[PDB]
Symmetry: C4
Subunit: 255 residues, 4 copies
Amino acid sequence: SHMSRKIRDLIESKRFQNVITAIIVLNGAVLGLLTDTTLSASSQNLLERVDQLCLTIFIVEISLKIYAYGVRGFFRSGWNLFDFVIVAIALMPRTFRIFRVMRLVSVIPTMRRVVQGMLLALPGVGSVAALLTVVFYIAAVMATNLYGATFPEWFGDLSKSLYTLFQVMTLESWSMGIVRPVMNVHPNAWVFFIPFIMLTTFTVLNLFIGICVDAMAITKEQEEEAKTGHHQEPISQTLLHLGDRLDRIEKQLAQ
Amino acid sequence: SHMSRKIRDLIESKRFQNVITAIIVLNGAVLGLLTDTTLSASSQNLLERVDQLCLTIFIVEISLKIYAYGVRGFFRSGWNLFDFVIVAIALMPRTFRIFRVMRLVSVIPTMRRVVQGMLLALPGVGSVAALLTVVFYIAAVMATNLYGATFPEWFGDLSKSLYTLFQVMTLESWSMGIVRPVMNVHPNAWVFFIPFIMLTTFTVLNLFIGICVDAMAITKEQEEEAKTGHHQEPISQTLLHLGDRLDRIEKQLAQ
Amino acid sequence: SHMSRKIRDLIESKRFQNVITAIIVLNGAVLGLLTDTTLSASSQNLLERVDQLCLTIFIVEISLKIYAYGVRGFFRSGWNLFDFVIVAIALMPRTFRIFRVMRLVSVIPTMRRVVQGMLLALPGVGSVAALLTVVFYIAAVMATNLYGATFPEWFGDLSKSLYTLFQVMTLESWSMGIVRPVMNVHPNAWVFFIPFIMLTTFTVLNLFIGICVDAMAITKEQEEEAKTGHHQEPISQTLLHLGDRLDRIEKQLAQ
Amino acid sequence: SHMSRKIRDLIESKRFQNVITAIIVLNGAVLGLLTDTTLSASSQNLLERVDQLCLTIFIVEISLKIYAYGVRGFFRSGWNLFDFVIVAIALMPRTFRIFRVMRLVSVIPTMRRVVQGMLLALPGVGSVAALLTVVFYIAAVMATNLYGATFPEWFGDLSKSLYTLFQVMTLESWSMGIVRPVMNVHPNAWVFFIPFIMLTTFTVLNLFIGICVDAMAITKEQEEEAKTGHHQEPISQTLLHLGDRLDRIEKQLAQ
Ligand code: NA
Ligand code: NA
Ligand code: NA
């Protein structure tokens, strides 16, 4: 139908994207103003009405998208499902309404590409992240058994130990705050904590560098296909294509 | 005119650059000495006169540049405008006179190239920086609503929350100073702060690596054009040129 | 023998790997539950029996591997020796039974490849690590002689100095906690500590980047050979092979 | 002369290098033992005699090198001058005798190559380091004028300000220790400190990454020439050589 295409072309336009972006910003701005404890009843009611207005615009927007694309369809995209869930959950009387400012990511294509680059880079680091998980679990069980009875606030149970070890890994007051006090009772505690810091800071660095490097490469390809409809072929492929061309030249040289 | 060219050749010489560099250093040295509270009236007046002398040399320098290049002209360069604004603002009776030591960057070509490499690398990271901005805004609104009434010094309002979250992201006393005290009242506060630290430290790393990698590549090209008048062609272009040469050889092989 | 091959094919199957993985997780879960101080005698005895059950499954597993591969043989692999030592040490009545969760690394091939990539990357950074060792030793001897008599808790002996310098390198309370107090007695102490921080943070960064970059390249090759039986040839080799092909074409062009 | 060559071949042997390495380690070990306050007079005198023995072996070693190479000659190498200065200064009755453990670097060729890679990488980062220097100087003058009268311990003079800003850049107690107290008197102090932290942490990262990347590339070339007498040609050169070969093939195709 001509109406489905007329709506699609409007939905897909820069102006419609700019209007929706401006309304997301307006909603974020009113929710930020609503954190103000000193506001009058009238000022609060006014801002709450602007929140309702912003929300209804989003319901019309999603309903226009479910029409112009179909329900099969619109829900085929992960970003449409996210946008749907975020607005639909608000119509169910979850306190943190500000999470709908995340819609800026889904609505802005360049921001959307950064996030999908980061998400697509996550499977490729799962073994490093599992190794980190294993090191933390082992260390938490050790720390609980070793220091729990003497330092219960920091190592009293598994939960307390996982928290303190996360603090230790971030190098936050690890020595003046945690290990120098522990060594007053357990003089060889550094044999546990120094190798733990060495292992975890290294692994967390590796984990983040791995994501950082992969995500940049993925986004760079997605940004190329968004502009030219294709991406740059790997240097190995270009070198392989040159080698195949040299085969035809070597063959033509004989005949 | 011959006079315009005689001045241009002087302005563009190494000696003129060295004299102006020495006067910037002299001005920086006298302003550093003027921070000394224990100085006598005579010593203070002497140094203040050396500041006036340094400033007048800069007015002559800029006036010589506006003459030898034209006003169209001299103002065509962003570094000339910056140099002009920095000296012209001093003739308007803005307390921080030391900001004129930044002129070392504009006056030294290698330092100028490092800074322009850093500035040209900024547009290419805007989506990562916006993502970081969005995460901070969302988190600040959440933190204000969650902990503002119980921890007003740290989360009392949006401003206080943005400051504390910046401190948390830098890992400064995040646990012993902020989160362990918050958990005494809100036992599940780690569900908010640990993912916030994970997200923001990762994003800030990505943002800085992105600038760091792009800026180095840009400066390396600018440093090449400064010396040889051109830069090294990308490996993809060299491989494409080889492929085009193989087309002419394959064509010549048949005929 | 047909029985040796029937067992090998079972040992090498995905199902056997999944069962052993599930039993490692079960053992880790029961040992984590045994850190709980508030557990009843019956609950403790039950979990201790589940630890015995998990351990006996591992003895059967290793015994099946020593049979199907031979003792020459099974012990030819470093991962089999590690798995053997970990289970065999438990049969010698070393308190830290949780270290057997490290078996997840040896049992999961992708996790095994990450760790062997990290280990193979270590010889190539030995000179940077030795340089770091030398800087720490020199600095520890200096710090002991300089500040030991006035600050005995932090620099009293070599051991105390090595610990404080490790804390200083990690930037943990280095100034408010260590150097500002030392400067109250030794005003030029910053001449020692600031260059030490500059040197060691740089070296530790270099050491970790070196491992991080090498380990990723090694694992990427091992992951390729695991799937395709071979890895991608270096760009230098592909370029050398193209050059050798151009020699045959230049030779054929004359004759 | 045959004697000069017989000594050179001994000096250059692995055994002579191992003996000298063992004596450097022995000297380091005795100097580390001499930090012990509780040592008896006899134990101290014994270790002091072992220090004299180690030192005399080094005088014979350097004298053998000045003979076998010549004084022109031996002093032609920067590592020989360093080794000479380190042993010659000990014969002038400078308290820190432990600095002679640095000789391990000059005596071990792989360690020597890491350090020369780091030194050769320093000129190429001078403009980034100068930019950092400029930012620190400007900020120190500002901080002294702004906060010196109200916070004299931290910003009382230029020296105190340079120290506090170095602490701020390392993110050590920057907020709980320095900026939250400063904001109690100067509520907008974050306008100064947050951009300062943003600028300096970024610049120091860039400076260290620059050295780290360049130093690795230089050492890798030096390690290649040490083993094969030459290094791997850049990918740009190999691609340029292939292009030159394609010129001769295109020329031969016509004639
Ligand atoms: Na840190
Ligand atoms: Na810290
Ligand atoms: Na700290």
